[PDB]
Each structure stands twice: as structure tokens, then as C-alpha cells.
Design a binder for this molecule. Structure first.
Ligand code: CA
Lengths: 408, 409
């Protein structure tokens, strides 16, 4: 079995793309949530909150032949992957397209334009905006394919479109593909584009925060006064690479991936089950041949929903006890959906490298319904980790747990 | 210490029926399942009026409402397929499969029509009349995988393989590797699709659809000189994959063993296929099975009946095996069943292998000279006694899959 390391990280997020910009934003303690007055267009959305990207600069040199197939979510994915490849030292590399780099990627949904066009085709038969490019922009695997095609990659495409589990399954399944010798390298990530329908998914479940006048004060993971999540967007990509290969070219190695656990609650489509969530974490620990005691920090899923936070806290307390430091980056960028597992893995590794762990924003009173954990808040925590864990729990009760090993 | 993997359950919902005996009779009777689709006059700009629909489908009566709310048709097909495959594997009424030992790999090209309409219209006009709390789960990329997994309360890993045409074959392949690698003892693996106007527009807008609107019995025509495109079909198919000792220990009837899986992409074009990388996918499978090309007695083509698809596939196959290789396309009967195609074709290929009986490509009367010489079975079924068979599929984005199944005599 091959060992697997991370030699590239990048993305487009509500806090920026470079880590130094993101660190400053984390450190400044304001979230990226805003009012969305344009959503008055939609008939029946309660929430008027989101955490959009502060625009998105499509690079000038991108060729039409390639961009015709991309809506925003695929553009995000590609841009993320471009940044990660540069960071990994592969800018202009001629060899990565030879069939031994593959792509694992997904999103909750394709792009708005073709969803509108195909939906209207059903509604009225009209095909005005249905084109030969509509499917590839809508398709479940739009992100994975667009990323792969963009660098003329010829490896396997692993299409991990599993709503919020998209990015963490990408990482995990890419990791297993390298470990078992199918691919030498993998681009692995997740992405999402913000839209009204993307928000309606959670708003119709009453899972969304409706504090429409106080965007700076919501969401509030594990807080007693939380009232739901806030939807965000963007993408993040990790370059995973077989260990000897990385060593042989003298790559700067950000982390090693040592465990991945994945299961399902098999119970509720939305209402999470703590025991099976805990079991995902155990599976990861078993895969890493580690005791729970080895983990210095957990990066929560931490959506700020009522049941989600309770069930996650119990799952975590069950695996680790009350001593575990934990925080939720969704307090800053919201629930970035398809992107969340990749963005959170990335930032969790950045924090691990620097012995600096961001607090959960807007957590002032720990909800007594949540299990006692070491909820970092108020100020960042200095920890010197050998191992960290990042968890995600998704629609359909799909659970993932990733364990990263420190590399000095 | 890799685990061997066998197939102990097969089933599905298809234009030719569900039971193999029923399907065999249809294959033998040599009529395709293609029909004129007058309803598509509703759509503004479709050239084709052909499809291969299911002749009907009704939910089993004993499916409980609480479990079916989250299903549109494609997920209903997927669940029914998987239900048949589970019975066939001996797991009906057996709840131990829910204990985390069994997982699910599944996908489709698309979610269901209703919520696509509802969300699309929300974008079009802001109206949310028909957007409900159940719309996303019926529309979502992984609707099939999640609905199947939830239906039996399964607690294993979900491997979403929604990759258009490659959905069913990637499901089988990646489920196979999960069992081989020891992550799961069992997996449901399959693919599904529901017929819709939009599903046909995907290919119609590429001019890849047949437009012989008055001659449904005569089209599609894989590898034929007179072919003019594909015909879109629908349905689902599920295989129960199972670790070998586990199967042996409970005395399971074993249909076949999966011995190789190759998966790559062309990295060239979104729709136009590249022969060399298609061949390489076949090689990857052969290498995974530690077999020489010589070992393969038959190839189940993808055989979509498109102009470039059939040429590229033929060359790729000739390049790997030489002119001697027997090959045929089940899409000549049921059309291109999209999400379902890799699973349905895998299933039927194993059924044919078990019986030494290989269906010809329907409506293949003059082999296109632009296609590479292969042993194109046609006119009558061929008797072959195979120790190994291969089933190939090539999809949107240049995604290629090759599966190798070993005879279990
Ligand atoms: Ca290399």
C-alpha cells in the first residue's frame, strides 16, 4: 500500500484565495455573511442571508473551447485546481496529463443557466436557451470533468457529487486510489455556486438562519442562540501525491493523509444519527491505526443547525471525550456545501502547520444541549498537533472523517 | 492480501422486462424496443421522435409512502432493480445487510423531471409553487445512490458514480475495488435513468440522435454503414457484489467473478472520442486481471450507433484484440439506456456468458467500412464458450471503462 501526501492546496473562498489573506480575515474576526436583497425576486425564501464570493475574476488566458462547458461552479473548481497545481510545482508540467494524474470532484448541483433552460423546457416545451453545452454545465460531474479536461488529464475521474460530502469524499476516495496504486496523483476537491435554489434546499427544511438584519451575528455553531445555517460558495482543491514520487522531486509536503472513514446513518434523509457519525471517526482512526487520544484537534462540520450541532457534538464526545479542541470554519464562510470538505481540509492543514487554530465565530454561550467539548472561542488557540481530524456529515446521512498527519 | 469479488445478485427494470427468461425470448425474437414518441411534439426543437421507453412501470404495492417520498422515477427504477438483485442474492428479509457491511455505488446522468422543472422555473420566474422540501433529494446528483441505500437502511459507504453513460460501469468498478480493498463486504452497484425530453436533447443538440422517425424498428444500427445516430432508452440494473469467502461461507449461488477494471479518460474532447485512450482503458483492465488480450472470448460493445463513436470504438477494440474478436451491442435492442447502460450491459453480458449464447447486433446488415474489422456477430446469436468476457463503455467527457468478468462454471 502506498503512502499519500498533499503537495498542493488552493481555492476561491469568501475570505480570498491566498492563505495570508485568509489568515488575516480569520484573525480580524468578521464573518463573510451579507444581506441578499436580490432574493426578493424569489417567491417564498425566508432567509435573506448568504456568504457569497466577493466576485470571481475569470482569468483572461482561459480558452473559449474550454470555458464554453463551464458555469460558475466549474469555473470555481478549475480556478481552485489551477492555484493548487501552481502551489504543487506543476505549473507547465508536461507529464501530469499522461494518465497518472486523475480527478476526484463534485458539487451539490450543476449550474443555474442550464437548470433554468432544461426546467423551462419541461415547463413549457420552450428550448430557447437549451444548447449543446447545457448538459455539460448542468451535469452531476461538471466540476470533475471540467477540471480534468482543462489540463488534458487522462486519469480516472471519480465523481464525488454528494452534496456537502463532495469535497471530503473527493479527498478520501482520491487518497484510496493513490494508496492502492491506481493513480500516482489526484486533484481532489469540491465546489458550489451560490443560487436561490441552492438556498431553498435548506430554507424549505427551516434549517436556515432568518436573522436577516444581523448578518455579522449569524451563523453561530454550537451557540445557544443559533437559529440555522448560512449558505456560502466557492471551491478548493488538494493535490494528493504518492509519497516516494513527492520525495523524488523534492516537493514541499503540506501533510500526509493517514486515515479516511466513510459510512451512512441509514436512518434519516436529513436528521443525523450520532452513533454512526461517531463510527465514521472510528473507521478513520482504524484506517490510521491510531487511538482517539492521538488527535490534537477536530475541525467540525459545525453547520449551526439545531440537530446537526447537537448530534455532531455527541458523536465527537463519544469518540474523544470532553477534552477535544474543536471549531467550525462555517462560522466565517458559512456552509459552503459542495466546497466544504475540501476548503475545511485545506484550512485545517494550514492551521496545523502554524500551530494556530481559529475560534468558532459568534459562539458566546455554548448550547447546553451540546456535548461538552473544548470549544475554542473568543481567541485562536495555539496547539502543536501531530494529527488533526476534519469531519463532514451530509444529506442522506453520508458521513466522512479525514485524518492528516503533521509533516515538519 | 486483496479480496476476490463475485457477483451473487443481478436484476433490473428494462424495456425487454425484468426476468432473464423474458429478456432472452425478446432478444431471440429480434425486434428492438424502439418506438415513435409523438409526445415530443410538445418540445420546441427536437429532431428525433424515437425512444426505447419502458413499456410500463408501477411501484410495488408494498413500498411504504414514508420511504417513496424522496423518489422520482429514476430512483424508483434504481430501487426496484436493487430489490430484484437482493432477492436474487438471497438477502430478501435479511436485515444483517444493514449493519454497515453493505454499501452502495450508483449514479445517473440526471435527477428527476419534476424538481428540475420546479427549480428551473424558480430561476425562470421566481415562482416556488412546486418547490418542496423533497425536491432536492429527487433532483440531486446522487438521488439514485442515496434512495437505494436509505431504502434498506444501509450503513456502508456511498460511492456516487453519476457520470452520465459511465455511471453503471464506474459503479461496478469502484464497488469492486472497495470490496477487493476490504472496505466493504458487500456492495449494491448499478446505474439508472428515466426517459425525458431533456435527456434526449443532450444528444439531439449534438446531432447524435437517429432521426429515422418513421422506421423505429430499423434504428439504431451499431457499426452499420447506414446508421444515423443513437436512440435514447431508460431503466436500471443492479449487481450485488460480494467478497468471495463471504459468498462461499453462506453457500451463495455465484454468477461470475469480477477480475479486472480499467478506467481512464481521453483528456481531449468533451464528446468526440479518442481511440488510443479507449484502447488503453481495455489494457488497464487486462493488466488489472493479469490477462493477455488472448484470454477474452467476447466483447460487449458500448455500440451507441453514432458516427464517430462506433468508428473510434471499433479501432480501439481491433487495436487491443485484433480482427478475431467477437463483439455486439445490446443498444441495438434497448437503445442507449444512458445511466443504466453499464449495469444493464454488464448483467446481460454475464447472463449470455453463463449460457454460451451471444445476441447479435440487431439491424447490422452491412458493416461500415470506416469501422475496423472485428467479428461483428449479426443475423443469428453466436455460441461461444467463454472463460472471460469484457464489457466496455465510453462516456461524456471522454470517460472510459472496461470490465472483465470471469466464468464461474
Ligand atoms: Ca512522475
Amino acid at each position: 500500500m502506498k503512502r499519500v501526501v498533499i503537495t498542493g492546496m488552493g481555492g476561491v473562498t469568501a475570505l480570498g484565495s491566498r492563505w495570508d489573506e485568509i489568515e488575516a480575515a480569520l484573525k480580524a474576526g468578521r464573518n463573510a455573511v451579507r444581506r441578499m436583497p436580490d432574493w426578493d425576486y424569489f417567491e417564498s425564501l425566508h432567509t435573506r442571508l448568504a456568504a457569497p464570493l466577493p466576485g470571481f475574476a475569470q482569468p483572461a488566458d482561459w480558452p473559449r473551447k474550454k470555458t464554453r462547458s463551464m458555469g460558475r461552479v466549474s469555473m470555481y473548481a478549475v480556478r481552485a485546481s489551477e492555484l493548487a497545481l501552481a502551489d504543487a510545482g506543476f505549473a507547465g508540467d508536461e507529464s501530469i496529463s499522461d494518465g497518472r494524474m486523475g480527478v476526484a470532484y463534485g458539487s451539490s448541483s450543476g449550474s443555474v443557466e442550464p437548470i433554468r433552460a432544461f426546467g423551462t423546457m419541461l415547463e413549457s416545451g420552450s428550448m430557447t436557451d437549451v444548447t449543446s453545452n447545457s448538459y455539460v454545465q448542468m451535469m452531476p460531474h461538471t466540476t470533475a470533468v471540467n477540471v480534468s479536461l482543462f489540463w488534458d488529464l487522462k486519469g480516472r475521474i471519480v465523481p464525488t457529487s454528494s452534496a456537502c460530502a463532495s469535497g471530503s469524499q473527493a479527498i478520501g476516495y482520491a487518497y484510496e486510489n493513490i494508496a492502492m496504486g491506481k493513480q500516482t496523483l489526484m486533484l481532489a476537491g469540491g465546489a458550489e455556486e451560490l443560487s436561490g435554489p441552492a438556498v431553498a434546499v435548506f430554507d424549505t427544511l427551516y434549517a436556515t438562519s432568518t436573522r436577516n438584519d444581523e448578518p455579522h451575528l449569524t451563523p453561530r455553531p454550537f451557540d445557544a442562540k443559533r437559529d440555522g445555517l448560512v449558505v456560502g460558495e466557492g471551491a478548493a482543491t488538494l493535490v494528493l501525491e504518492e509519497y516516494e514520487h513527492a520525495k523524488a522531486r523534492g516537493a514541499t509536503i503540506h501533510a500526509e493523509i493517514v486515515g479516511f472513514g466513510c459510512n451512512s446513518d441509514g436512518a434519516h434523509m436529513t436528521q443525523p444519527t450520532a452513533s454512526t457519525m461517531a463510527r465514521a471517526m472510528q473507521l478513520a482512526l482504524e484506517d490510521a491505526k491510531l487511538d482517539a487520544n492521538a488527535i490534537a484537534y477536530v475541525n467540525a462540520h459545525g453547520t449551526s443547525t439545531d440537530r446537526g450541532d447537537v448530534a455532531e457534538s455527541q458523536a465527537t464526545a463519544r469518540t474523544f471525550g470532553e477534552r477535544m479542541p474543536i471549531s467550525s470554519l462555517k462560522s466565517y464562510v458559512g456552509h459552503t456545501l459542495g466546497a466544504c470538505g475540501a476548503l475545511e481540509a485545506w484550512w485545517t492543514i494550514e492551521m496545523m502547520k502554524r500551530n494556530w487554530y481559529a475560534p468558532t465565530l459568534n459562539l458566546t454561550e455554548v448550547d447546553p444541549a451540546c456535548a461538552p467539548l473544548d470549544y475554542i472561542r473568543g481567541e485562536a488557540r495555539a496547539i502543536d498537533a501531530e494529527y488533526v481530524m476534519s469531519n463532514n456529515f451530509a444529506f442522506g446521512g453520508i458521513n466522512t472523517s479525514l485524518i492528516f498527519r503533521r509533516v515538519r
